[PDB]
Each structure stands twice: as C-alpha cells, then as structure tokens.
Enzyme design. Structure first.
Site, PDB file in Angstrom:
ATOM      1  CG  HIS A 123      -0.495   0.207   2.528  1.00  0.00           C
ATOM      2  ND1 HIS A 123       0.110  -0.453   3.179  1.00  0.00           N
ATOM      3  CD2 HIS A 123       0.356   1.889   3.518  1.00  0.00           C
ATOM      4  CE1 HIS A 123       0.009  -0.257   4.601  1.00  0.00           C
ATOM      5  NE2 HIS A 123       0.524   1.744   4.170  1.00  0.00           N
ATOM      6  CG  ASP A 130       0.190  -4.089   2.779  1.00  0.00           C
ATOM      7  OD1 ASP A 130      -0.222  -4.028   1.641  1.00  0.00           O
ATOM      8  OD2 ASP A 130       0.057  -3.627   3.728  1.00  0.00           O
ATOM      9  CB  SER A 161       3.102   1.856   7.789  1.00  0.00           C
ATOM     10  OG  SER A 161       1.874   0.810   6.840  1.00  0.00           O
TER      11      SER A 161
END
Lengths: 294, 294, 294
Positions: free
Chosen positions: B45, B81, B161
């Site tokens: 992402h 992901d 992240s």
C-alpha cells in the site's frame, strides 16, 4: 527467553477462554483459575448475557491445552464487574498465583494476559499508571458502576478482558476489564469472589443518593434522594455537594459511588456536605442493596 | 546507550524512506534493505498508487546517510501487502539481518522501526501480543486481503509502515503494516519476496468462495460460489458453514481467506462443512489466481 | 523496587498539581519544580483560561506531601505552550533535576510523569519515537502553534500534561503536552523559562507569512503576505513554495513555523523559494513579534 515471555508463558496455563453460545450469538472473554476445585474468575460483562438468559446460552471453558469443559455460574457482581464460574471434576489444574494489590506501586511493569487460545486474544505490556482510580464501567440489562481500578498503559481490550493483570513475579494483581486500561484490584477480587463462592451473591451498601460531579464547593452534588432512604433519614438534601463519605474525601460522582461501597452496612457514618455555602455534617446508616441476601 | 537505543541504531542503516511523487501527490513509507544487490521490501500500500499509475509517479529511496537513489518496482502482492523495490549499483549497502518468525513468542520485546529520515517517522516499542493472527487489510484499486499477522502493542502507524518489526537481536521478524498493530511475519515475507524477485509476481490459490463469519455451527458461511470454480466442482453450496480448510480449523471469514492461501494449488484438499445441520466433508482442487503466471 | 518504579518515585516530589478554579470552572494540570525559589514550569494551555481571566480564576499548587500553596503566573508562551508559576516562601522544595534533550536518542526509555495527587493523573512509559518533530498544537483565546517536539509512544494525556518527560537517570528531558505523544524539549524549555522568569515574556521572530503545505516543488506554499512585513520587504510572494528558511530545509507548513522561530530577530536571513518553477533565493530581516518587549 525474554523477560516478559517467561512471565506470560508461566501463567498461560492458569488462563482460560470463556465462551457463551446461543442459537444466534457466541460470546467470548478470558478468565483466571483461582481455585483448584475448578473456580474461575472473570468479569461480569463477559458472561452478562448468558446469566440473564440462561435458558438459551451455554458457557464453556477452553484450557491452555485445548480441553473444552462445561462451566456453571457460581455468582456475579455487576457493581465490581466480577463473576465466578465453576468447572467440575477437572484434574491437574494450574491455579493462578494471586498477589497483593496493596503492594502494587506506580511504575510497576505489568502484563495484561488474555486467553492463550481465545479468538482474537492479546497479551499487552505496560506499567501501573494510577492506583485507587475510580472509573465508570458501562452490559445489557445490568446497570453501570464505578470501581477503584488499577490504571495501566498496557492495552486492555476484548482479547484480554477478564484475564489477569500480572506482575513481574507472575502473580495476579488484577482482573482486566475492557468494558488507558483498567483492572479490578486483586484484593477486591479476593473479597468479592470469596463471597460469590460461598453465597452466590455479594451485598453492597446503599444510601439512595444519585449525584453529579461539581468542581469550582467541589465534589459530588446530590441530584436526587430516594424517599425512605438512609439519606432521607440522615437529612441529606438536593443541591448538596457531598465532599466526604466516611473517611474518604469525595472528588466527584465517581469517587462518591466508590466511597459509599467502602462504608459499613447498617452502621452510622458521617457525610460532610456544603449546603448553600454552609459546611454541614450529616449522619447516615447504609442499607444493604440486597435485603434478603443480608 | 539504552537497550532499545542500541537496537534501533544498529538497524537504522538498513531502513530507508520510500517516496512516490507525481504532479499533485507525494507519498511516503518505510522500507527494508533485504539483499545487497539493492532489493528493498516494503508493503504494497505504500507504493500502490505509483504501481497503478507508473506514467505519472516517480519512486525514490532515501538512505540513512541522506543519499537519494531512483527505485524500480520488482513486484508486489496486495494479498500479503508486500512489495519489492530495486536500487541499481548502490554500494556499501547495510543489509538487514532477517530472523525466523516461527521462533517468535508472545511476550517478546520488539521495536517497530520507521525510516530514520522519513517525514513523520516513528520508532515504537512493545511486545508480541498474538501470533498467527488473521487481520483484514484495507489501497486505491487493489482489493482488500487478510493475513496471518504478528500482533504487537508497539504502535504501527504511517511513520513506521513498511519498516521492519525488530527483535532484541536486531533481527527482522516482520514488516510493519499500518494500512493493536500488525506485521507481516518475516518467514512469509521471505517466501513472497523470493518469488517477486524471481518472477515479478506471486501466485496464490483460489476456490471461488466468498464467506461471511458466523458464530453460534460457527465458522465461515458461504455467501456466494463462483460458477465453474473449484468450489463448483467440489460441491460446496451457499449457506454452508465452512469449519475446516485443509489441516486448519476456520474460526471465521478472516481465518478462511488465510486458510485457503495455505493450500496447495492444483492438489486435492478436504473442506469440512456444516450444511443444514449436517457435517459434510468435501474435496476441492484449488486454482491458481493467476493462470498465466502459473 | 521496579526499574520504572524507582525512577517515578524519585521524581514524584518534584511534580505538583496545578489547579485553576473560578465560580463555575475548576481546571487541573501537572507542573514541575524547576527552581528552589519556587518556580514551577507547566504548559500554557493548563493555565490559559486563568491567565486570560485573572479576575475570576484562582491558581494553586498541591505538592507531593498534600500541601496546597497559592501560585502566581510569572509568564507564559502560547507559541511553545509553556508557562512559569511562582510559589513564595515555600521551604524544603525538591527541585527537579534537568537533563540535556540534545543528548536524547531514539529508543531511549522514558516516563511521562503526572502530578502524583492530581484528579486523574497518570504515569506512562515508552520510548523516544522521534526527535525534532514539528507538531501543531491547538486553547481558548490563544492562537495555535507548532513546536519541535520530542515524540514518544508513552501516552501523553490530561493526567500527565504539564508534567515532565523523564529519562532513566530521573532527569527532565521534556515537558508533556496533551493539548503518539509529544513533549517540549527541555533545552527549549530552559530557554523559554529563563526569559519568562526574568522578563515575564518571550519574544519570537516573525515574517508576516502564512503558508500551506505542498508535496509533489514540495515545502510550505505562501498563502498570504502581510503588508509591510519582513516578507513584504524581502520580496516573497504568494504561490511561492518555501523550501528553506535560514539553515533549515522546510518540509511543510509545520516545519516552516518552527524554522522561522530558529531565526535571529533583526538579522538578515536567506529564504529559498520555488516560484512558477524557478529557484529564487530571497533575503529577509525578521521582526520581533512583540515590538515593545524587544
């Protein structure tokens, strides 16, 4: 092995999953084996729906090994958000080792342990952030309550609610309650559970008073007095600002509810009040909230 | 130096900033140098928009020293992901040291390390709260997914992240994913990246089944069966409650999606189902979700 | 005693409760005894309402022992969210031991200590997540600001706001500000308080510029230029993308506000700008935001 890993593994056998299932609802929480005869303490909101609809719900315990066992409700207390379950004739139980929450200090490292086999169970780590902290707890049919909690920055969530708050000696110092995290202290759990195991009920004092917090004449301001209540007979009125209940200064309506419960039932007690600007001390004799269990 | 300070400094060289810029959008995340030839793993992402609009976006790596280098997408997997980037002919790279996430235990102390030079990067600390925890991940054009994550009470946010989840031996045991915190385990990252580096694609099995969770006959209840799917040919129907996929009990639709992906593609597998109240086992042969990459 | 328990107990004497009460409002925060003569540093939003309405509000300090003492506002700075209070002729004060926030490193273990006797005070534990992190702070009549904060995953809340962020040598490295957690660094606190104690005011530079962040020509884009401002005389225009203020690269409008304040007042400074696509350097002489206190 890590220093929190050893502590969480050593108590994993003493933690269980608690599941309440019906035709179209299945409910989970964590629990703690407190007695070798099969007594398991959880919090009241984990089992609230099953206890209120026992004809449709079924409660089971899943141990660390995976063993599923039927469980029966010994008693429960929405006022402390506590409850006791019983599993019958289950052998080789690892009983949790229970600490002394009066020897707990701010800064103590803690683990908030969840059921090792629960659906989305968690084990969180933090410190003790506050002691003797009144917190309101919201449930279904039960009524909201307030408790002197241990506060912790270890996360208290659905995955460890009902499980133990553990110190670094692998001792239980509290029961996690998710419904910035809070635990019921173990010394209060020991008292409430000692009476739920014997009597299947706990009896708390009442005065018939509903308060709202005020801070400017700060304290718990009386919103309503029940007719015929101990506050009726003590002379407490509306718009009164309760500032001390017994030997405990009352900061707000949260500390009021908790200070009432630390009173002796059926024994005269002083209530200090600021009325229209005048310091008035009043005497009250607390009732048992359950007359026929007293 | 502090015990977490040493660990975070020792891996700071192996963590990079990942920036995707266009005419009116500039996107950031963290990444991890996994191979000395210039291979960098992030999560899908972080780079999702650039990979879906490669004519308008430009991706660069900023190392710990401040060096900015162009980066090219080797491959990506929205289903885990994950994603791989390549920087060409950059020398003296500090390659992250990769751990074994099957030796990770609940209670292990971890750092969720963000890009040392990122815009609002973070380094957070906590423990492992849960292992093999199915979590749904929501992105842009890509479709939502579910993964067996490591769960941690170390905060996982925009600032770490894509960076590594690090153990106390400065080893990578996971990849942080912010889009109560979750990481992709490193052993799953090793597999997905080993195939994205070689093939520029990863192939996952499919059955053509969409489920919804049920708990009362608990599991993943079939909402729809694709015509001509492996579930078409296996005999799976709607309103079926899938309770086991292969050698894995399915607690809900989250564990279903993850249990399908641990199946062998093109090889018969058993699916246990509760249909109208009757335990029915069914056989299915999973398809490759990408027929021409298989 | 636990390793965080010892650190929190050793500094509990240096932390105080700060209470601002009026006729129908009572306000609390934490504070830190920084000088033996009775100087206490808190953050500006704890005392904001009392300082803006001093005729109706009354401020007091409650020490660790329980002693309540009147307190007077020496000075305050909404721009750094800092403030100084003075208690007069209070003896045997435990003065906080102040650290050097330039020797603080990411990964350092910290405690965010709240007032030991505050209403719902907290003591939280974590690490340093980011240094020199610009964060906007929102208050009442005061205007919002931005500061280079220390970032921490120790929780910063109402119960420790204004209290110290403490390192593992029981030294203050920051002032907690709740209005993922942020602290004002102690070296900036030392400067702001050294001038609030002497002058009852701190003077910050201004340029007359309002920016909005841009990222694609990234930086702080000029939204408005005040007539007659130092930016008027420097030649800065609207739609300009400020990318460096002095010796500091400006990532966005947050870093802009903080970079302006690290400029010298009344002394020429370079401002690098991207105008219509063209790199333009400009010279500016910052004004004092308080002309008659300068």
């Amino acid at each position: 092995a890590g220093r929190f890993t050893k502590v969480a593994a050593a108590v994993a056998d003493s933690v269980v999953t608690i599941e309440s299932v019906s035709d179209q609802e299945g409910m989970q929480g964590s629990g703690v084996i407190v007695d070798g005869r099969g007594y398991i303490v959880t919090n009241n909101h984990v089992i609230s729906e099953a206890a209120n609809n026992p004809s449709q719900f079924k409660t089971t315990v899943v141990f660390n090994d995976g063993k599923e066992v039927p469980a029966n409700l010994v008693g429960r207390d929405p006022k402390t958000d506590l409850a006791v379950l019983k599993v019958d004739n289950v052998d080789n139980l690892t009983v949790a080792r229970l600490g002394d929450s009066s020897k707990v200090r701010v800064g103590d490292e803690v683990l908030a342990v969840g059921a090792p086999l629960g659906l989305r169970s968690t084990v969180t780590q933090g410190i003790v952030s506050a002691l003797h902290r009144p917190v309101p707890l919201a449930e279904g049919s039960d009524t909201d309550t307030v408790i002197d909690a241990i506060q912790t920055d270890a996360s208290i969530n659905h995955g460890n609610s009902g499980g133990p708050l553990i110190d670094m000696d692998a001792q239980v110092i509290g029961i996690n309650t998710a419904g910035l995290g809070f635990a019921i202290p173990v010394n209060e759990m020991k008292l409430v559970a000692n009476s739920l195991i014997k009597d299947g009920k706990i009896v708390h004092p009442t005065l018939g008073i509903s308060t709202r917090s005020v801070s400017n004449a700060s304290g718990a301001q009386v919103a309503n007095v029940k007719a015929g209540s101990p506050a009726q007979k003590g002379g407490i009125l509306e718009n009164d600002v309760i500032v001390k209940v017994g030997n405990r200064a009352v900061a707000d309506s949260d500390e009021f509810v908790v200070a009432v419960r630390q009173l002796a039932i059926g024994q005269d007690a002083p209530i200090e009040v600021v009325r229209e600007g005048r310091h008035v001390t009043l005497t009250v004799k607390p009732d048992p909230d359950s007359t026929l269990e007293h």
